[PDB]
Structures are given as C-alpha cells and as structure tokens.
Amino acid sequence: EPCFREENANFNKIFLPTIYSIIFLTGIVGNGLVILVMGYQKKLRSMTDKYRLHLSVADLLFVITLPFWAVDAVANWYFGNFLCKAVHVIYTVNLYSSVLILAFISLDRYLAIVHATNSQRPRKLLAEKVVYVGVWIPALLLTIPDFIFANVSEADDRYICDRFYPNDLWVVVFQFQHIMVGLILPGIVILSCYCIIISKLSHSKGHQKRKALKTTVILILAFFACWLPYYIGISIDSFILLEIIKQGCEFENTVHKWISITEALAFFHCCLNPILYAFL
Amino acid sequence: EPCFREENANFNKIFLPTIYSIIFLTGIVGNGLVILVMGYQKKLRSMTDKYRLHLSVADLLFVITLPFWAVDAVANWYFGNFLCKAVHVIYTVNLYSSVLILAFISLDRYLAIVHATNSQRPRKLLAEKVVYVGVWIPALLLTIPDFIFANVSEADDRYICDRFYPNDLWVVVFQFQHIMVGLILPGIVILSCYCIIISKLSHSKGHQKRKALKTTVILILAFFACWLPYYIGISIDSFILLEIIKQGCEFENTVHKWISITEALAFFHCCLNPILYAFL
Amino acid sequence: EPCFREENANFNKIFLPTIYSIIFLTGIVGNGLVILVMGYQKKLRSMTDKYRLHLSVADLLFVITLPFWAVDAVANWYFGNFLCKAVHVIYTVNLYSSVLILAFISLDRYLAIVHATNSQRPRKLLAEKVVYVGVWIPALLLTIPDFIFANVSEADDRYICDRFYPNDLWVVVFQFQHIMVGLILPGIVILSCYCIIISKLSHSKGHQKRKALKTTVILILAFFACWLPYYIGISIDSFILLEIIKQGCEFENTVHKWISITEALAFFHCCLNPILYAFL
Amino acid sequence: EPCFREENANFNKIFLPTIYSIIFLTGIVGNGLVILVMGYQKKLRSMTDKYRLHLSVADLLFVITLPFWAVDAVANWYFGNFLCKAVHVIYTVNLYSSVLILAFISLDRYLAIVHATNSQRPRKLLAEKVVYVGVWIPALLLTIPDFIFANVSEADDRYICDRFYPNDLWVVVFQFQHIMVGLILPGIVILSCYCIIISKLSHSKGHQKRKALKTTVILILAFFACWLPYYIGISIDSFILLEIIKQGCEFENTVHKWISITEALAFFHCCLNPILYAFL
Ligand SMILES: CC(C)CCC[C@@H](C)[C@H]1CC[C@H]2[C@@H]3CC=C4C[C@@H](O)CC[C@]4(C)[C@H]3CC[C@]12C
Ligand SMILES: CC(C)CCC[C@@H](C)[C@H]1CC[C@H]2[C@@H]3CC=C4C[C@@H](O)CC[C@]4(C)[C@H]3CC[C@]12C
Ligand SMILES: CC(C)CCC[C@@H](C)[C@H]1CC[C@H]2[C@@H]3CC=C4C[C@@H](O)CC[C@]4(C)[C@H]3CC[C@]12C
Ligand SMILES: CC(C)CCC[C@@H](C)[C@H]1CC[C@H]2[C@@H]3CC=C4C[C@@H](O)CC[C@]4(C)[C@H]3CC[C@]12C
Ligand SMILES: CC(C)CCC[C@@H](C)[C@H]1CC[C@H]2[C@@H]3CC=C4C[C@@H](O)CC[C@]4(C)[C@H]3CC[C@]12C
Ligand SMILES: CC(C)CCC[C@@H](C)[C@H]1CC[C@H]2[C@@H]3CC=C4C[C@@H](O)CC[C@]4(C)[C@H]3CC[C@]12C
Ligand SMILES: CC(C)CCC[C@@H](C)[C@H]1CC[C@H]2[C@@H]3CC=C4C[C@@H](O)CC[C@]4(C)[C@H]3CC[C@]12C
Ligand SMILES: CC(C)CCC[C@@H](C)[C@H]1CC[C@H]2[C@@H]3CC=C4C[C@@H](O)CC[C@]4(C)[C@H]3CC[C@]12C
Ligand SMILES: CC(C)CCC[C@@H](C)[C@H]1CC[C@H]2[C@@H]3CC=C4C[C@@H](O)CC[C@]4(C)[C@H]3CC[C@]12C
Ligand SMILES: CC(C)CCC[C@@H](C)[C@H]1CC[C@H]2[C@@H]3CC=C4C[C@@H](O)CC[C@]4(C)[C@H]3CC[C@]12C
Ligand SMILES: CC(C)CCC[C@@H](C)[C@H]1CC[C@H]2[C@@H]3CC=C4C[C@@H](O)CC[C@]4(C)[C@H]3CC[C@]12C
Ligand SMILES: CC(C)CCC[C@@H](C)[C@H]1CC[C@H]2[C@@H]3CC=C4C[C@@H](O)CC[C@]4(C)[C@H]3CC[C@]12C
Ligand SMILES: CC(C)CCC[C@@H](C)[C@H]1CC[C@H]2[C@@H]3CC=C4C[C@@H](O)CC[C@]4(C)[C@H]3CC[C@]12C
Ligand SMILES: CC(C)CCC[C@@H](C)[C@H]1CC[C@H]2[C@@H]3CC=C4C[C@@H](O)CC[C@]4(C)[C@H]3CC[C@]12C
Ligand SMILES: CC(C)CCC[C@@H](C)[C@H]1CC[C@H]2[C@@H]3CC=C4C[C@@H](O)CC[C@]4(C)[C@H]3CC[C@]12C
Ligand SMILES: CC(C)CCC[C@@H](C)[C@H]1CC[C@H]2[C@@H]3CC=C4C[C@@H](O)CC[C@]4(C)[C@H]3CC[C@]12C
C-alpha cells in the first residue's frame, strides 16, 4: 500500500535554487573559458586535455539545462511536456558520459606509464576514434529510454516531470542498471589501472613519471566522492522497493530527501571540475 | 490578504548582534589602518590602491553606522526618526558605491592589459575624474529615494524603521532596480573585461603580466560570493510579490529569515576586504 | 518577578564534559612541556618568552582546576564548600592575569620597535619588576571578592556553586567591572600600541623588524576572538538586568546557554596557546 | 527499573551506512595498496614501516568485516549466530592491537633517540619477537571473552547481536577494563616516552633528529583524537550503571547515540591511517 503526505519542505524550496544558481554561474563561466582557451586556440599539449575538453562540453550542456531544474524546484513543472524530455535527455547524456571520459583518462594513463616503451599510435587512435564511439554512442543508447518514458502527468493538481513505468519491476531494473553503469563498472576499470600503475611505479625515484598522476587522481577521487552518497541513497531506496527493507512509511521520505540533497552536491562536482582546472 | 505572526526569533536577537559587533571591530580597525597607511602617507605605487582607498572609505562609513543596526536588531527602533533616514542613506551609498568601484578596477585592468602599448593618460584621467563622477554621483542619486521614503511608523506598539510606499508596485519596481544595478549591470562588465583579458593572455608565458590579476580577481569573487544568496532571496520574494510563487504564508517568513542572515554575511564581506589586504 | 524552569539540557550534560576533558589533556600536556623546556632549562633567548612562561603557569593552574568543572557540569556541586571558593579563585586569577600578560607583551613590542635607539634597561626593569607587581597583585585584589562572596547554597535540592550577592546592583556592578577590566581597558592599550607601531613601520622594507610581530599578533587576535562572544552575551544579560531589554522570560535562558557554550570555547583558547607555540 | 522506548532513529539508519561504506572503500583500497607496496616488494627502509604494516593488516581485516556492520545498522541482525561471534572477534583484535602497535612505535622512537649511542640489536630483537608476542597474544587473550559471551537473542522480534552477561557487574567490569587497556595504560607509556624525548632533544639544533618524529606524532595524535569522545561516552555510561549519575531515563538514550556516532568516527580514523601514509 503506497503511502501519502509527500511534499517538498519550505526550507528546501529556497535552499535548492541557491545551489542550482551558484552551479549555473560557476559552471557556465568555467566551462566556457576552458572551451575557449583549449579548443578555439592551440593549447592542447598533452593527451588529457582532449578528454577534459569533452568533459567541459558535457558539463556546459548540463549547466545550460540547470535553470529549468531551479524553476521546477520552487513551485512545479507546468511549462510544457517536450521540455521535460529534453532536460532528461541532456541529464542522462552528461551523467553517462562523464564517467566514461574518466575511464578513458585512466586507460590512457595506464597505457602511457606501463607500456611507455613503444606506444604512441595506440594512444592516438584510441583517443580519437574510441573516445567518439565508446564515450558517446552508449550515452545516446542509454538516453533512448528517456524519449519513450519521460513525461509529465498531473494527479489532483500535482504536475510532476517524472519518468513513469507500468510496473515497479521496470523501476528497480533501471535503478540497478544506473548503479551498475555509473559506479561499479567504470570504478573497477579505474581501480585496476591505477593499482597496476602503482605496482609498476618502482623504477628510479620520484620524478615527473610519479608527479604526472596527481591532477588525474585528484579529479577522479573528487568526482566519485561527490557522487557516493547519492548512490548509497538510491541503492537503499531500490532495496526498499523489493520488499527487503520494509520498515514503514517514514523511511522513504528520509531517503528521498537524502537523494535530493546529494543530487545537488553532485552538481556541485560538475562545477568543481573547472575549479580544479584553475589551480594547476 | 496579508498574513500575520511576523516576529524575530529569540536566537536571532542574540546571533545578529554578535555578527554586527565582530564586523564593527574588524572593519573599523582594518579600514582605519588602511586609510592611515595609504592616504595620509605615500604608499600608492599602483593604480588599484586609489580604488581600494575609496572602498575603504565607504566601508569605514558603513561600519561606523553599524552599531545602530546592532541595537535595533535586539528590541526595536524607538530612538528617533532622522537617524533612520541617515542610516539608510549611508547604507545605500556604500551598497551602490562598492560595486561601481569594483567595476572601475576591472576596467582599469582591461585597459592596462589589452592596450598596454600606449595607455597611461587614459588610465590617469579615467581614474581621477571618472571615479569621482561615475562612482559617486549615481550613488547619491540612488540615495535620493531614501530621503523621501525612509521613515519609522508604529503599528500597535511596533516601531519599525522601514521604507514605506503607497503601493506594492513601488516595492517590486525598487527591488528589481536594486537587483539590476547591484548584480546584473556591473557583473556583465566585469565578466566581459576579464574574459577578453583571458583571451588576450596568450603571449610569452607566465610572468607578472599573468600574476597581477590574482588579488583583483580574488577580491571580486569574494565580494560577489558573499552577496549572491541575499540576491537570490530578494528575487524570490519579489516574485512572490507579483502573484507568481503563491504558495501560502509559510514561505514568506522563511525567505525573510534567509534575507536577514545573508545581509549579515554580506557585512562579513565588508569586513573581509581589509583581511584580504593583510595577507598580500 | 523572577522566572522559573531553569535547568541544564540533556545534550549539554554530555557536550560540556567532552570539551572540558579535551582541554584538560591538551592544556596540561602543552603547558607542562612549555614550562619544562623554558624555565627549567635555558631556552629564553627573547623577552616574549618570559611573558609566555607566565601565561603557561596561569593556564596550567586553570587546567588543573578544570576537572571539578567537568564533574559539576554533569549532575551537581555537592562535594564541599571550600572547593567552590578555591575553584573560583584560580578561575579569576587566570582570567585577570592572561589579559594583563598580553598587554605587557604589546607594551614590550612598542618599546622595542618605536624606541629601538636606546632602550634595553627600561625593557629589562619593566619586564621583571612591573610584570610581577602589575600583572599579579591586581589579580589577587580582584580575587578578593571571590573569598567573601563565593558559596554553595541549596534551594529545594538544588546545590549550586554560584556567587551570591544581597542585591542585583552588586551583580550588575561586578559584571560591568568584569567587562571593563577584561576587554575594554587592555584592548585600548593593545590597539594603541600596535597602531603606533604600524604607523612607525615605514623604514627601509620588509625584514625581521616587520616579521617579528607575527606570532604576537596572532596570539592576541586568537585570544580575543575566542572571548568576544562570551562578552557579548554577558553584556546583553547585564542590560536585561537593568530593565532595559525587557522582552520576556524566554530570552534569559537563551543568553545563559550562549554564555555557557562561549565559556567552553574560551577554555579552548586556553588550550590553543601552546598549540600556537608548537607550529613556530 | 530498566527503561523502554529504545530504537534507532530514521536518520541514523541512512547516516551510519554511508560512513560504513566510505570507510569500507577507503580502508580496503589504502590498506591493500600499502601491504602490496611494503610487504610483497622491498620498501622497508626504516623500522616504523614494519609496525605500520602490522597496523595495515589489522585495519584491512576490520574493514573487511565492516559491511556486516553496515547491513546490521539498517534493519536487524537475523542472518546467523556464528557471524556475530566472528565479527566481534576481529573487532576486538583490531581494537586492542592498534594501540599496542602505536605504543611499540613510541618505544622504538625512544630507544632510537635517547640511546642512539649503541642500540641496534635491542631495536631489532624487540621489533621482531616482542611485536609478535606483546602485540598479538594479548589481543587474542582479550578476545577470549568474545567467544564465550557474544550471542544473538530475540526479545519480542528484536534480534540483537549483543554481548550478554548474567549481571551488570560483568558489564561495568568489562567496560572499565576496556577503558584501562585502550586509553590509560598505553597513553601513559606514549606520553612518558615522548616527554623524555623532548627533554633530551636539546643537542645542536633542528635537523633530521628533530624532524623524524613528525609523522609518528601526527599519527598518534590523530588516532587518539578520533577515539576520545567515544571513551568519554562509555565512561559516563558506566558511571550511570553504578547508580552514580542517576538522572532519569532520558540521559541513557543520549549517551547511547553519542557512543554510536563516535564509533563511526573511530572507524573514520581506521581509514585515516593510509591517508596519512599518502601525503608523506
Ligand atoms: C563566481 C564565479 C563566477 C567564479 C568562477 C570561478 C572559476 C570558474 C573561474 C575562476 C578562475 C578561472 C580560471 C582561471 C585560469 C584558467 C587557466 C586557463 O588556462 C584557462 C581558463 C581558466 C581555466 C579559468 C577557468 C574559469 C575559472 C576557473
Ligand atoms: C540527438 C540528441 C541525443 C543530441 C544530444 C547529444 C549532443 C548534444 C552531443 C552528441 C555528440 C556530441 C559531440 C561529439 C563530439 C564532439 C567533439 C569534441 O571535440 C567537442 C564536443 C563535441 C562537439 C560533442 C558536442 C555534444 C554532442 C553534439
Ligand atoms: C540574480 C540571479 C541569481 C537570478 C538568477 C537565478 C534564477 C535562475 C532563479 C533564482 C530564483 C528562481 C525563481 C524562484 C522560482 C520561481 C517559481 C516559478 O513560479 C517562477 C520562476 C521562479 C520565479 C524562479 C525563476 C528562476 C529563479 C529566479
Ligand atoms: C557529496 C557532497 C557531500 C560534497 C562532498 C565534497 C567533498 C567530499 C569532496 C569535494 C572536493 C574534494 C577534495 C578536493 C581536493 C582535495 C585536496 C587534495 O589534496 C586531496 C583530495 C581532496 C581533499 C578532495 C577530498 C574530497 C572532496 C573534499
Ligand atoms: C562521511 C563524511 C566524511 C562525508 C559527508 C557525509 C555526511 C556527513 C554528509 C554527506 C551528505 C550530507 C547529507 C545530505 C543529505 C541529508 C539529508 C537531509 O534530510 C538532511 C541533510 C543531510 C543529512 C546531509 C547531512 C550530512 C551529510 C550526510
Ligand atoms: C579582531 C580584529 C581587531 C582584528 C583586525 C584584523 C585586521 C583587520 C588587521 C590585522 C592585520 C592588519 C593589517 C596588517 C598589515 C597591513 C599592511 C599595511 O600595509 C596596511 C595595514 C594592514 C593592511 C593592516 C590592516 C588591518 C589588519 C588587516
Ligand atoms: C549629503 C550626503 C549624501 C553625504 C553622504 C556622502 C558622503 C559621505 C561622501 C560623498 C562624497 C565622498 C567623498 C568623495 C571623494 C573622496 C576622495 C577619496 O580620496 C577619499 C574618499 C572621499 C573623501 C569621499 C568621502 C565620503 C564622501 C564625502
Ligand atoms: C562588545 C560591545 C561593548 C561592543 C558593542 C556592543 C553592542 C553592539 C551590544 C552590547 C550592548 C548591547 C545593547 C545594549 C543596549 C540596548 C538597548 C536595548 O533597548 C536593546 C538592547 C540593546 C540594543 C543591546 C543590543 C546589543 C548591544 C548593543
Ligand atoms: C555569503 C556567506 C555564506 C559567506 C560566504 C563566504 C565564502 C563563500 C567566501 C568568503 C571568502 C571567500 C574565499 C576567499 C579566499 C579564497 C581563497 C582563494 O584561493 C580562492 C577563493 C576563495 C576560496 C574564496 C571563496 C569564496 C569565499 C570562501
Ligand atoms: C552552496 C554553498 C557552497 C554555499 C553556502 C550556501 C548555503 C549552504 C549557506 C549559505 C547561506 C546559508 C543560509 C543563510 C540563511 C539561512 C536561513 C535561516 O533560516 C537558516 C540558516 C540558513 C539556512 C543558512 C543555511 C546555510 C546557507 C544556505
Ligand atoms: C591530544 C594532546 C595530548 C596533544 C597535545 C598537543 C600539543 C599540546 C603538544 C603537541 C606538540 C607539542 C609541542 C611540540 C614542540 C614544542 C617545541 C618545544 O620548544 C617546546 C615543547 C613544544 C612547545 C611542545 C608543546 C606541547 C605540544 C604543543
Ligand atoms: C593566595 C592565593 C591567591 C594564591 C593563588 C595565586 C598563586 C597560585 C600565584 C600568585 C603568584 C604566582 C607566581 C608569581 C611569579 C612566578 C614566577 C614566574 O617565573 C613563574 C610563575 C610564578 C612562580 C607564579 C606562580 C603562581 C603564583 C604563586
Ligand atoms: C578517559 C578519560 C577521558 C576520563 C577522564 C574524564 C573525566 C574527568 C570525566 C569524563 C566524564 C566525567 C564523569 C561524568 C560526570 C560525573 C557525575 C558525578 O556524579 C560523578 C563524577 C562523574 C562520573 C564525572 C567524573 C569526571 C568524568 C569521568
Ligand atoms: C569562540 C569560539 C567560537 C572559538 C573561535 C575560534 C576561532 C574564531 C579562532 C581560534 C583560532 C583563531 C585562528 C588562529 C590562526 C589563524 C591563522 C592566522 O594566519 C590568521 C588568524 C587565524 C585565522 C585565527 C582566526 C581566529 C580563530 C580561527
Ligand atoms: C561570526 C562568526 C564568523 C564567528 C562565530 C559566531 C557564531 C556562528 C558562533 C560563535 C558562538 C557559537 C554559538 C555558541 C552558543 C550557542 C548558543 C547555543 O544555544 C547554541 C549554539 C550556539 C548558537 C553557537 C552557534 C554558533 C556560534 C554563535
Ligand atoms: C575514494 C577512495 C577510493 C580513495 C582512496 C584514497 C587513498 C586510500 C589512496 C589514495 C592515494 C593512495 C596512496 C598514494 C601513494 C602511496 C605511496 C606508496 O608508497 C604506497 C601506496 C600509497 C600509500 C597509496 C595508498 C592508497 C592511497 C592513500
């Protein structure tokens, strides 16, 4: 039996737009400046800069989308139907593309350090062609469900832009797929690559070969640190869905609020990328 | 139908005076020392020092005004009528002068970096004459409404020093004007100048030409960061005024409290300026 | 008409002992090590070390006293009458001696910088003889009221070790005296000395003459920063006592809790001194 | 008369698993990498590395145990009886082994600094043989009570994996023993060794002999700082047990919540060790 009394808190209606607007401004300015400096001009000296440019493009699209999130968080979504689908589409594109870009950065680091003897053609070919196919096509393929399912439906004057499925089985399947492709699958690749790099990092002593990984590792740990609590919340909610953590109706509201605040902090990570790009 | 039950919380009556007193002490000491070192003696080597001196003068006047704010925040305003007008006048003068001084600093940086070939007479003339007219006269012109409208009126033993207008149309018009002249109009100029500087900052390599902007950019970002949440709150309240975010009487109190605390943190920025002047 | 319903919160009964115990350990270890290194051995190279040794002795005595505070904060004071007087005596001695030691440090800095031409005998004589008389005798003279007035009296099984006076006039007079001799009187001397030093610090350029003040100024600002909120709270309470801020019975409890927590943070400063002594 | 209404808060059921999962990931990765770099390869240049390897092994075992804690914190313990005993066994092993390893590090530092004249054979023999016996055997001997007493018992559908004793005398005796062997006994040894080192550290001037203690002292202070509040909470609870702090039924719940959160932060220390190992 579904519960009731689900509504947004008064403090949240003012706290969330502040976060969204700060992320709006910071992300737009930083990503635009990074794109202008890197792509338009000639500043790509290393191979990580191209992946960082892809990251900047995805983050710029998402932060452009954000003001609709900020407006919706206050009162409601009652300004169209196609805009809900569009917002969900860029959301999913950025969400599934940033992690794959990070995994490609880790793979490039592994190929550059472990097989430094003769590997420049593999790195170049992988970089160009595989980043295009591997990092983008799957993002669109996972946005495919967004076109079909995203919609806005009112329920006694309650207009919500929310993905709707005929049954809860679709809900749990898609949440588990989100977890698997967002955290577990690329996390294993990143961990394996960096562990092998660390094991092989026992030649001569500290040098540029040892200090070249600092920026990449800081970026990766920051990206995953701002995302972990949201993943924990959604995993707990999905477990509640399959009659495993049945504990009453007062747990679902708490986990939902956890999910919302942690989504806001993930968008904070989306802004945190160019900030890391500033310090150098 | 206007709501009721508007009163200050017991915790606020002790939290606000603490912030006001800390700002009192820090701002007075720092601004006085900066004025004494810079104006009275001969320590103006660069051109940013004169604008910083103007900023120090404005902040010193505001922090001198502050103890009346601290006294009012506790119980009430029942110690005159002309003092309310005076307090509002220096408040508005500082509020509309600091942003214009920052915009002039940004303009000077743009003229110094982009057109470094032959530009010293434009910088000197602009600095002196335009800072006087452009940065001050408009501040007084925007304090003009304060003389007319600021007043203290009791309502069943409720003495409030608050600007009063015949209709809410004046309220929304003046709030929108405050937003436009405080955040949007100078922010665009600052962003354009610094973006053009960044685009043109691609000659030779890192040097004093690249490290001269650090203090100015830190000052500007700090100034705007301590002000953004207050602007978000007032924008939301103004939207509530024009029957757009009608959501009940429990949202207005929350946004009012948001506005108060964020005003206190803005005064914290007013103190944060000389602190930035200390580290060097 | 005095109000009722005055009792300690359940969370406070566990929060306060934690702070007291942390301060116990840190202060005892740091002050003991500082005394052992400085007094017993020969490590006094400068003239600030002797004043710092006096500060260490006073702080060591206070932190030795602290566990009685920690025990009292939990349940009650029912383990004697002479111990209450003793605890109040060392409390007052440390409280009125630390500020005077800081003022003497500031005076020594002023004499060392402004009159560096011929001043070593004034500094030595002042240091020894005036620190003894000026910094100690007045502390005992202000502890004189503690012997007379400190006592423990039960009121329906409520044993409180609290200073008792026949009238509230004594209460307000002694609170105002505490404020005047704790913050205003030495603060003016410190501010005047450092302002004159800053005005006279315009010879040659940055050197040891400019970097010798860093530790002293950091110590002084930390000392006053951990104390300001408590002084604000007691000033507000004293004003409530003289029928000035009459606002109901719900303000006194809030200001009392403010006073308690801020006292704990002041003891945190008492521990913060040797920590500043560690970094160098 | 025992009280009632003991249950976990809804917010705790989501806050605790987040901490447990973060500690899971960070501890496993860091400790595994440290073990792989140090033990498997040849990177033990100093004598502190062996004790740090022992610490890493113990922390790795505990963080492996942790996911059962995370699962239990949500709903209940209803997935066995032998697993409760096992979890308690590794918990106690790590808890009583980390402090002894720290004490051995302090003893090695004392022997290396105070008796640097002729002491290499004592350090080697002590290191190997005494770390094995002294640091391990007692840990197992103190886990001996865990085998006997750890159990899961339901009480009206309340399955709790909790140590059970016939009387409260056993409870207070074992809590006092835990405090004595966890904080007081090794703390005295560490303090004595470091105080004697500081007293003897008055030869020549600052050098490697003075900078070799930084990492060890930082590790020790961090270890004890993340543990002190939990010890304060358990001491207060044990005092409540022996009819000393009888203050009602509303104090026990608060101290229990204090204990839980502080346990989580102690596990945070368990993760903080390899982080300290990263910065160098
Ligand atoms: C409050 C908001 C507007 C502040 C924005 C702060 C961030 C986003 C700004 C401040 C400093 C800026 C960076 C400063 C320097 C560089 C290095 C250059 O090679 C690329 C541009 C880049 C990377 C800028 C990106 C945008 C940037 C990071
Ligand atoms: C049809 C719907 C799904 C469109 C949404 C996806 C769009 C926004 C994506 C898909 C392919 C993407 C492009 C793929 C490759 C490049 C080249 C790179 O150097 C900069 C980014 C850029 C130019 C991307 C921009 C964003 C992009 C156009
Ligand atoms: C000065 C800057 C920060 C303003 C830009 C931030 C914008 C995007 C945010 C701040 C507060 C938000 C407003 C508050 C929420 C609503 C409710 C909706 O019924 C009308 C749109 C409206 C009124 C929002 C528009 C977007 C908004 C104004
Ligand atoms: C998800 C919500 C709670 C936001 C969390 C943001 C925090 C947890 C993230 C964002 C920025 C991150 C930090 C970015 C920079 C540094 C300094 C570097 O030398 C170590 C990593 C460290 C210390 C990161 C730790 C994790 C971090 C602090
Ligand atoms: C473990 C530490 C080091 C990282 C930070 C974890 C905790 C402290 C942070 C991360 C996410 C944060 C939570 C985000 C979501 C919620 C739920 C909401 O209803 C209250 C705020 C609250 C409760 C925040 C409390 C603090 C929080 C849980
Ligand atoms: C608690 C309160 C009183 C502390 C005040 C702290 C601030 C305001 C003080 C502490 C250090 C001081 C600065 C220290 C050094 C300089 C550099 C000199 O070229 C101008 C004076 C100036 C700029 C001082 C300004 C005031 C200052 C910034
Ligand atoms: C009539 C009412 C509005 C008066 C309020 C505005 C007053 C306080 C303002 C207006 C003009 C201002 C002056 C304009 C220019 C200078 C020169 C500069 O090197 C230091 C500040 C100083 C000296 C300003 C001090 C403050 C000032 C006198
Ligand atoms: C450290 C102190 C002395 C610096 C200045 C403190 C001031 C700002 C503090 C301390 C004394 C306090 C004031 C004393 C006088 C009054 C008048 C009364 O009707 C309202 C309370 C009020 C307004 C108090 C508010 C807070 C207050 C003004
Ligand atoms: C408005 C209320 C919440 C006060 C907010 C104050 C905060 C948000 C402001 C005040 C001081 C500011 C900081 C001042 C100094 C630094 C260090 C510099 O290297 C980067 C900018 C940074 C990091 C600023 C970030 C924004 C900042 C932290
Ligand atoms: C987005 C981050 C990085 C910058 C800080 C934004 C938030 C966390 C800060 C800035 C302004 C702060 C708020 C200022 C005003 C209010 C409303 C008041 O009723 C409760 C305090 C509260 C709620 C503060 C909570 C935290 C706050 C919102
Ligand atoms: C948790 C508790 C026990 C930690 C105690 C930390 C503080 C008090 C300890 C840690 C480092 C110690 C300092 C380290 C170095 C010095 C410099 C020497 O010339 C005098 C001793 C002195 C000044 C020590 C004083 C005590 C000290 C500051
Ligand atoms: C009778 C009551 C009030 C006694 C309480 C005050 C006692 C504890 C005070 C008063 C005089 C003080 C002494 C005065 C001078 C010195 C010399 C100095 O190099 C170290 C501290 C030392 C040794 C002080 C120790 C503490 C002291 C003995
Ligand atoms: C292990 C370390 C931290 C213990 C030392 C801290 C001591 C001083 C603190 C911690 C908690 C405090 C206890 C809690 C409060 C009471 C109530 C009183 O009716 C008996 C004394 C007693 C029981 C306190 C004794 C002092 C105490 C134990
Ligand atoms: C009274 C309660 C709230 C405790 C307050 C403690 C705070 C406010 C105090 C204690 C320690 C102090 C800091 C100690 C060290 C530094 C770093 C130095 O480069 C500038 C001063 C600064 C930044 C001090 C600021 C004030 C400070 C942060
Ligand atoms: C102004 C800033 C920079 C310095 C810190 C000031 C404020 C934020 C700090 C200093 C003292 C702190 C207060 C100490 C006393 C109280 C009263 C108690 O019932 C709740 C905790 C509370 C409310 C603390 C809240 C935060 C606090 C007021
Ligand atoms: C979010 C999680 C996965 C991040 C894990 C961060 C910590 C545990 C990682 C990040 C940096 C890593 C360290 C980086 C460098 C070294 C030095 C080498 O001589 C041993 C491995 C060691 C000691 C690594 C241990 C594990 C480590 C400390």
Ligand SMILES: CC(C)CCC[C@@H](C)[C@H]1CC[C@H]2[C@@H]3CC=C4C[C@@H](O)CC[C@]4(C)[C@H]3CC[C@]12C
């Ligand atoms: C029977 C029960 C109690 C077993 C639980 C204790 C186990 C896990 C403990 C007891 C003895 C321990 C070993 C003792 C010594 C060493 C050698 C050292 O270089 C690495 C750790 C290692 C290899 C330990 C691993 C963990 C260990 C096997």
Ligand SMILES: CC(C)CCC[C@@H](C)[C@H]1CC[C@H]2[C@@H]3CC=C4C[C@@H](O)CC[C@]4(C)[C@H]3CC[C@]12C
């Ligand atoms: C994506 C990563 C963070 C997941 C790994 C964290 C794991 C160990 C944590 C996160 C939340 C926890 C879940 C929440 C609590 C329960 C209740 C129990 O009735 C079933 C197990 C289950 C469902 C837990 C399994 C362990 C769990 C999933």
Ligand SMILES: CC(C)CCC[C@@H](C)[C@H]1CC[C@H]2[C@@H]3CC=C4C[C@@H](O)CC[C@]4(C)[C@H]3CC[C@]12C
């Ligand atoms: C028990 C719960 C509250 C967790 C507490 C964690 C805090 C108190 C611990 C964990 C990490 C520790 C810090 C680790 C690193 C440093 C920097 C070093 O130069 C001084 C010690 C210092 C400053 C430690 C202070 C104590 C510390 C901050």
Ligand SMILES: CC(C)CCC[C@@H](C)[C@H]1CC[C@H]2[C@@H]3CC=C4C[C@@H](O)CC[C@]4(C)[C@H]3CC[C@]12C
């Ligand atoms: C003394 C300072 C410097 C170190 C940190 C001590 C305090 C502030 C920290 C350490 C442990 C923390 C507490 C851990 C446990 C509890 C009890 C729970 O019901 C509320 C959270 C609360 C209340 C935390 C509040 C803050 C806390 C007490």
